[PDB]
Design a protein around this ligand. Structure first.
Ligand SMILES: *[C@@H]1O[C@H](CO)[C@@H](O)[C@H](O)[C@H]1NC(C)=O
Ligand SMILES: *[C@@H]1O[C@H](CO)[C@@H](O)[C@H](O)[C@H]1NC(C)=O
Ligand SMILES: *[C@@H]1O[C@H](CO)[C@@H](O)[C@H](O)[C@H]1NC(C)=O
Ligand SMILES: *[C@@H]1O[C@H](CO)[C@@H](O)[C@H](O)[C@H]1NC(C)=O
Lengths: 50, 39, 50, 98, 49
């Protein structure tokens, strides 16, 4: 006697800048900048001379 | 200006369907090949 | 964006506010995004008087 | 200690390029974010009216996202709508005492 | 938004303009513009048309 239709939501979203806002609440998000290095000269496969 | 690619093709027709809005490859299934004047 | 009617009692043009302010702020969004400032300071590398 | 005059060119050049990528970085994301949201809204509407001309002369509307069938439709009838095989001419004769 | 609000009430021409099929005076014309037209009052007489 009725067939509604919907989408999915969570409780806690993440806040992203679109082109016409700051901070829109979005169900999942993804970091695009790298912040954590590795404090070691990772020299596999190269005959290293210190 | 010097690029590093050697081919970069640019479209100038619709999507080729032989036999965002959902009519080209949509609820109109195939294209026509027996239509030669209009698009 | 407004209305206009016609009936047995005449005529009348109104307006509609919700859609009007739905449109103005998005351009104002585009405006305030574009109107922004450089924080980057450039020095004097080439001489002029000799 | 690189030499003074040539070291100033490198710092000038480096920070110049740095403003270019950091500008490119945030427009690329923001432009991408905008297309992501109506992509999921487009797919919401295409699904929505697909039910409408499937329930061709059968449903009215309210405007919440929800249809309103005008004859008794039990759970197999409710199943035939969700797998894209509802056959409306069974019911067109009795979706019109309404 | 005006169309499924005027659910079984308006036809169309294709200029941007609807066409009501019963006598709709200016309060009826006001109830359409503030999103509170209640069509079942008139569905019984938007169907001699
Ligand atoms: C959401 O994005 C993160 C990226 O940090 C990913 O690990 C995760 O699998 C994604 N999906 C969900 C449902 O959280
Ligand atoms: C160039 O910049 C670095 C810091 O990024 C600084 O240590 C160096 O002294 C600069 N060169 C000159 C010639 O000022
Ligand atoms: C619904 O779809 C499935 C998948 O094709 C089909 O097997 C089934 O018979 C359909 N109808 C009902 C009433 O489940
Ligand atoms: C139109 O909208 C206003 C604002 O909610 C409301 O007060 C009024 O009663 C509505 N109806 C008419 C007939 O003006």
């Amino acid at each position: 006697d009725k067939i509604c239709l919907g989408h999915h939501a969570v409780s806690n979203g993440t806040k992203v800048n679109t082109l016409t806002e700051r901070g829109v609440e979005v169900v999942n998000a993804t970091e695009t900048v790298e912040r954590t290095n590795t404090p070691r000269i990772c020299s596999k496969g190269k005959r290293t001379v210190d | 200006r010097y690029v590093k690619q050697r081919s970069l093709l640019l479209a100038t027709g619709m999507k080729n369907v032989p036999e965002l809005f959902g009519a080209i490859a949509g609820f109109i299934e195939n294209g026509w090949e027996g239509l030669i004047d209009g698009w | 964006y407004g209305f206009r009617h016609q009936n047995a009692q005449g005529e009348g043009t109104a307006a509609d506010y919700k859609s009007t302010q739905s449109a103005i702020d998005q351009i104002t969004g585009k405006l305030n995004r574009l109107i922004a400032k450089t924080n980057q300071q450039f020095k004097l590398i080439d001489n002029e008087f000799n | 200690e690189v030499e003074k005059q040539i070291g100033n060119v490198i710092n000038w050049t480096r920070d110049s390029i740095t403003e270019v990528w950091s500008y490119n970085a945030e427009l690329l994301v923001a432009m991408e974010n905008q297309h992501t949201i109506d992509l999921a809204d487009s797919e919401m509407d295409k699904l929505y009216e697909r039910v409408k001309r499937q329930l061709r002369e059968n449903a009215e509307e309210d405007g919440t996202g929800c249809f309103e069938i005008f004859h008794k439709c039990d759970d197999d009838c409710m199943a035939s709508i969700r797998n894209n095989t509802y056959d409306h001419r069974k019911y067109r004769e009795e979706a019109m005492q309404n």
